[PDB]
Amino acid sequence: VVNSTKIVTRKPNDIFNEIDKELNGNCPFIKFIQRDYIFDAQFPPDLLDLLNEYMTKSSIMKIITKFVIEENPAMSGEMSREIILDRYSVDNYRKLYIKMEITNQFPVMYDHESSYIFVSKDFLQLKGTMNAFYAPKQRILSILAVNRLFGATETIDFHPNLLVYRQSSPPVRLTGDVYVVDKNEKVFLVKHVFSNTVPAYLLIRGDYESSSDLKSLRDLNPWVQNTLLKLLIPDS
Amino acid sequence: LLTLERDHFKYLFLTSYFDLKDNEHVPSEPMAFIRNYLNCTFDLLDDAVLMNYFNYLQSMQLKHLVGSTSTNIFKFVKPQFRFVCDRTTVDILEFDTRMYIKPGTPVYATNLFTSNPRKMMAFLYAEFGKVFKNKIFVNINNYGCVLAGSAGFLFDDAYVDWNGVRMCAAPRLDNNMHPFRLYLLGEDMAKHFVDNNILPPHPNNSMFMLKNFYKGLPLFKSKYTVVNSTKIVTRKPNDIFNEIDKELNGNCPFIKFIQRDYIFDAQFPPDLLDLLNEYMTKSSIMKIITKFVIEENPAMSGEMSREIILDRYSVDNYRKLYIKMEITNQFPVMYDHESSYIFVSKDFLQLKGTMNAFYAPKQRILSILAVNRLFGATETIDFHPNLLVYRQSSPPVRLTGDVYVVDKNEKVFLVKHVFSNTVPAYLLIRGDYESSSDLKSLRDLNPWVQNTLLKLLIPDS
Amino acid sequence: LINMRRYRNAARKLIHHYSLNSTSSTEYKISDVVMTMIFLLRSEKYHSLFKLLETTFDDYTCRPQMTQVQTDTLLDAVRSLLEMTIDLTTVDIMRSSFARCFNSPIMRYAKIVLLQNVADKRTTLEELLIERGEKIQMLQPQQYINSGTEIPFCDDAEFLNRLLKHIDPYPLSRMYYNAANTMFYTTMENYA
Amino acid sequence: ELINMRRYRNAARKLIHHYSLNSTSSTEYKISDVVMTMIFLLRS
Amino acid sequence: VDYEKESKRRKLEDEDFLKLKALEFSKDIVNEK
Amino acid sequence: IFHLIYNNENAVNTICDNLKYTEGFTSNTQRVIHSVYATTKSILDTTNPNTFCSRVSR
Amino acid sequence: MECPFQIQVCISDRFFAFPHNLVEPQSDVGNKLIENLIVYVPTDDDRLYIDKKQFPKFNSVLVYRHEHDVNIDSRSPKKTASATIVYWNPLVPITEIGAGETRVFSVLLTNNLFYCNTMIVHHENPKCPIEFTYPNLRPIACEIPLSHFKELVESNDFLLCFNLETSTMVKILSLKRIFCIFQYRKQPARYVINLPHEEIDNLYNKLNWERTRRLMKGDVPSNCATVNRSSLKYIKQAQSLLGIPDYSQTVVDFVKMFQKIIFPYQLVPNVIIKLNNFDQMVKIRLFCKNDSIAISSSGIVPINMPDFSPPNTFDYSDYANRTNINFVTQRVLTDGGFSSGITVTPVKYNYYL
């Protein structure tokens, strides 16, 4: 333990603010852990302190990073230290700064556990989706390829108006992977990687044309496919 | 065990803080006590006195002073000064390409000094490996090892900035005898040494030694033949300028204005200030200040074997000294061809952003000293094209000597001119002018005038 | 508390109009005058100007006496407020205008006036003509051109077209209004 | 003190009373007087 | 006394490293295919 | 113009020198020649870099 | 951004050419070396510069263009124990890893590799090229420098060209490789980048950030920096004003010209000040060996002290007042017979006068 501190709250926005501050300062990624038994009893504070020395391999963890990654290294922090936020109780959390060491033990996650990306004010997570968000100022609907969203205190219901039809006298050319969602409505899904190398897809509606051959949606992964089903099929 | 009085703490600081050799003036008690203190025969010394001295340093508020109540501070290699490295690197300059340090990295000056960093490297890197271990790739040279530009250790001189870069030749050469101080990068290294009481194996010694709280400035006793003296207190630069002007006007051909290069290090006790007044640092600041207009006749000549010195020995206290002109008098080392300073008179104003350019309104003249600095300017005027009022003349006004073209379209020229009192400079003129001889390229001009001209001419878009 | 920013804005607009430093013409009201005076009182920076105007509440047919330091402070304050340049002549113009306003009674129709009581002896245009012409004839030509010469007309038709495009969105009506009122107000100041 | 609180009170009382009784100008009160009254109210 | 043999050897290599790369991107004697 | 388009530096230099020693070169002919040469060189400098990039283009 | 410890990254300018010798089979959990090798390259053309015959340790060698697999989170890439995985100059996140440790060689150090745990940085003695912005140049297809390798190591005047649809990361990698080749050139080479000024500025910014990352990882400082276009324009204006032919004077030497002033006059040259300001838009401080003070844009400062002395160090009230300022300004106006363009400012003072 390089350093430690504790906090108490029942307001998720507080935890999200702590995470956002840590990420903004210098943290490339935070290990947010939640103990998988904090709901089993009103544990005495002494018992909580005793348990704090220990961890359960099955507890919950999230590798949370920031959506926008600063290009320059001016924001780089210590290269041999990590930040952990442990929800060791129902309402008490402990922030820990520890030395980056292999011997450190951690809860077992999925072999290819998808990373979490913090939600910024530039967009809002679509209700009923763990990986879909909408940027109003950009008028863009985006679906993370393999990454979860995190920290969203607010969500917006999907609505066709979001997919404002782009007007263009000549069809706007597109490149890379393109998929047809609704030929009648000129709705397409375009593979897009955020310059910080975050894979995702952009759902667009408008006068578009593809440089290459359009591709079947079945090529997409089940994650994006499930999100798309939720977003597209009306919940009659 | 030897002891020492608070009244002798001034002697202790004088001896231990600076690179002073004129130790003959230390009374007997402080002499012996400091001798043992420096040779690190701490077993013969009262540790309580060391704690008292540390508290005295804290009371005087020495900058960067960091420590605890452990005698290991003096008895072992320990971080004694702390400060953050923050270099606004200018890659276009061929700086002294030392090991890179990440901005914001803490840096600690330890009391350890070595005559050969490469030999200490074994032990120091052993400690570094103890601290970090693993297989961390590090930048290691014969003068230290650096981890990710954020941790580790290195050897340098006893005095570095860590905020600026290294450039140009050294006005001082004390490396002849000066061992390299040890510097520690990272709270990790600092804390490790503090807690572990690290100390290299003994072969003080020839190989290395400890100089606790040893800044190492080239201090020396003035040995001045003081004809007269006086002191003043002020924070108003106009007051100092007025004193200088009075001295120059009366009979002084030139004044030696000295400023001590450490007056910002602590709230030095007045007793300590008095003790230091007997001494001077070779690296302190000096300015040879004369008067722009030099009276032609000798009626204004003063004593030919006396000099006037104005020493800013503290932040707010200055001492004016009249001393006999004597070669043996020691002075701070200036540049081999240190340019002289010229006092600014009311006839003109120094141009903002220029150390050698001024404008005379009544004459409507912009002048740039060839090799001389301006001094005393409490006011400055922003450059503006209106200053270069275009001279009207039906026939082009003839010019002689060296002439240079600044703007042919705007009839702007630079004319070499020497003030009758033999002060070289150039006059920037705009108007209907013609040259008797061939016009000359500006590249012929020195870098000093060239820099001033660039500042004055290129608009700061 | 008060909206010192709004107070300041109203004060600035009113001062501009009453100093003839802005061709802009708009409605003004006792609310605006009160804005101005309250801002001046509240501002430590402008206490001197507040005092000057407050003195107008009296007979106001008097020349305030100030030290050079006082005059410089007042001019600096006014110049900082209007961000310009200025003159103690403008100071006196504002004093007279505000005195006339303060002494004026509440009314429904804004009193259109001309400049009056600025800078004792009444002089006619003829006397000014005689005196100024004599002094001018005394003066000598600073510079001159020779006979003939040639008006330097431009030639680049593309340059002319570019300028035309650059000026197209400028309403001739507004430009004419601004220019005419500028000339009129400067003439008014000279006369007063 | 810039404000002559006594004179300011006098003017403020005059106008407020005047207005406390009627609903008009009564043209011997002058914009100044308003200003006088309002400044008094601010200061008090 | 652990000299920076690594740095010295690195510079020595860099001297002819460009020539070695030129050898790599040189021409081949024959076309086996 | 032709000796510029076609890379004939010898002919260009010959013409330049002859114009230097022909007619009132200094008065206005020199400036006219420099203007024409500058225009041609500007066009050629606009074209040639893109042409070379096209040549080596994959 | 997180990286898996299973990847080890080596950064070296030499890696502009693939380091065949450094490749080695990786062992599995059973300590069985894998005879299959998979080499990943940023572009298809790169394959032609991988000689499979230079891998005796392996029995099968395959080469592919690394491509972002949107279906795999880089935070936990899929593992393929059947082959040893090597990435050369990767431009997109590594979504696949080999047996043992997945090896990476790169001349670039992007954020993706920046957080990579194992970072091996090769150090080189700097050797800078020459920026020669100017409308007999030798065109170079930057996308394929190794094709032009002979010319790059022989000639000294290169026109750097790019295909229209070349990607930004491809451009950055090509420029980095070319600059490494110049770093190994004995004779600095002049070059001209046939790209828009803003694009060149962005590329230079990204290269600077990459160099910063390398330094933070422990790379040796290199003076072989680059100049933003605004700074170049300012330098050109200065040279023209001084009457210095641009082709004759190099920017580096132009700046060095004022080192004679830096220390002896204890002043920061205005050229350096302006260059620093340009970089900031995209303060100065320095000293000499054994020097007791530091020269700064603010003036003289005691070593290690802040760039500004305590506020109450000097009292300027005597002249730093409206009365004195106005008096001096009015005197100047009267004496010079001026009516505008005059401005007087009180002179403040840092630590020292």
Residue numbers in the entry:
A (entry chain X): 240 to 475
B (entry chain F): 7 to 209, 218 to 475
C (entry chain C): 113 to 196, 200 to 234, 238 to 310
D (entry chain D): 112 to 155
E (entry chain I): 462 to 494
F (entry chain H): 117 to 174
G (entry chain L): 1 to 135, 162 to 308, 320 to 390
Task: Quote the paper.
The entire basal structure was determined to 5.2 Å resolution (applying a C7 symmetry), delineating two different symmetrical rings: an outer one with C14 symmetry surrounding an inner one with C7 symmetry. 3D refinements focused on these individual rings with their respective symmetries applied, resulted in higher resolution structures, 4.1 Å for C14 and 3.4 Å for C7 rings. The baffling distinction between the two cap complexes is that the anchor-2 rings, which are very similar to each other, interact with innermost components displaying different cyclic symmetries. In the apical cap, anchor-2 connects to the C2 symmetric part of the portal leading to a C14 to C2 mismatch while in the basal structure, it connects to the C7 plug producing a C14 to C7 symmetry mismatch. A major difference between the anchor-2 complexes in the apical and basal structures is the presence of Ac98 in the basal anchor-2, which interacts exclusively with Ac144 from the lowermost Ac101/Ac144 module. The inner part of the basal structure has a C7 symmetry and functions as a plug closing the void created by the peripheric C14 anchor complex.
